Design a protein around this ligand. Structure first.
Ligand SMILES: O=C(O)CNC(=O)C(=O)O
Ligand SMILES: [Mg+2]
Ligand code: NI
Ligand SMILES: [Zn+2]
Length: 331
């Protein structure tokens, strides 16, 4: 079995290997990359996402989210307070202000220490989940607005034609902005490209050990667990690496820098934080190997998780027994 310790793997495809996205994903899995839950892909040196980022400041963040924490430094939840709209230029200036800017630090490890020590005492503002793309239309390789759609993959594998669309989302981050522990909707893959700015640190639990994380989370967040049998779908809980180590949960960590792709694999729980002002683009995708994960994915039916239009069909076709209860949650 390849990669039996579930280490995060890093790949350096040549320009030739970068042509066929599906083929490269299947290659990475042949080497065991999925066992980690997360992989890094460094694009060939000849590739570029677009020519420059000099003209992005007029993009609108219609609903910036202030991420307010509650709990203790290593075990906390966050709620998202909606703020007034602002442009990317306005947000960048805010991220760079004294109140929100990255502190002086020695290296990524010192910054990681400071994040876990001090995150809860601040409420950074995240421009998340903004439909759109920063890939040039002429970029033909690994262009996250030109991937094959998940609806087309389900149709190719299973023969059933379904409604829905699959588009990318932009993320504008600042120091301490945080992504809570989660897997993707319907335990899909995700791909994330860091277009510009400061790094993003990731934590990940191997898919084969995801239930260990869930059992810890039920212990650490006991009221939330009673409220919903899939409350990590709410995407609000954080647990530090120190706490994960104390409780014997297998995980790995890696820092993504500008110009790099990360892939998350089906049922790979992940969480992380931004080092400073940055912009990422991400989208969900599927392969044949996902189908079985989609059929088994947990679901939130309490009403909190509220998701896209396109998840309806996935539930309806892959999880018909759960469909009625899940749909009630959506309405
Ligand atoms: O970058 C972020 O804030 C969150 N991204 C992801 O969870 C992802 O790409 O799957
Ligand atoms: Mg602009
Ligand atoms: Ni994710
Ligand atoms: Zn729920």
């Amino acid at each position: 079995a390849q990669n039996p310790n579930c280490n995060i793997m890093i790949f350096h495809p040549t320009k030739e290997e970068f042509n066929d996205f599906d083929k490269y994903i299947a290659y990475m899995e042949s080497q065991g990359a999925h066992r980690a839950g997360l992989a890094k892909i460094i694009p060939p040196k000849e590739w570029k996402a677009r020519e420059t980022y000099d003209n992005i400041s007029e993009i609108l963040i219609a609903t910036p989210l202030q991420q307010v924490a509650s709990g203790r430094a290593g075990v906390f939840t966050q709620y998202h307070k909606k703020k007034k709209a602002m442009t990317v230029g306005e947000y960048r200036h805010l991220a760079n202000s004294k109140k929100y800017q990255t502190p002086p630090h020695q290296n990524f490890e010192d910054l990681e220490r400071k994040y876990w020590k001090n995150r809860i005492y601040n409420s950074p503002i995240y421009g998340a989940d903004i439909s759109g793309s920063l890939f040039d239309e002429n970029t033909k390789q690994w262009n996250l607005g030109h991937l094959g759609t998940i609806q087309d993959l389900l149709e190719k594998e299973c023969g059933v034609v379904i409604e829905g669309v699959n588009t990318p989302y932009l993320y504008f981050g600042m120091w301490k902005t945080t992504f809570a522990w989660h897997t993707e909707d319907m335990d899909l893959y995700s791909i994330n490209y860091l277009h510009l700015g400061e790094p993003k640190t990731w934590y990940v639990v191997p898919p084969e050990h995801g239930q260990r994380l869930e059992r810890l989370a039920r212990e650490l967040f006991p009221g939330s667990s009673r409220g919903c049998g899939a409350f990590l779908r709410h995407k609000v809980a954080l647990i530090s690496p120190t706490v994960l180590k104390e409780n014997g949960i297998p995980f790995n960590r890696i820092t993504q820098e500008a110009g790099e792709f990360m892939v998350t694999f089906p049922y790979g729980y992940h969480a992380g934080f931004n080092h400073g002002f940055n912009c990422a683009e991400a989208i969900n995708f599927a392969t044949p190997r996902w189908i079985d994960y989609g059929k088994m994915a947990s679901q939130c039916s309490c009403g909190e998780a509220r998701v896209t239009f396109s998840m309806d069909a996935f539930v309806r076709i892959l999880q018909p027994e759960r469909y009625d209860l899940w749909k009630r949650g959506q309405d």
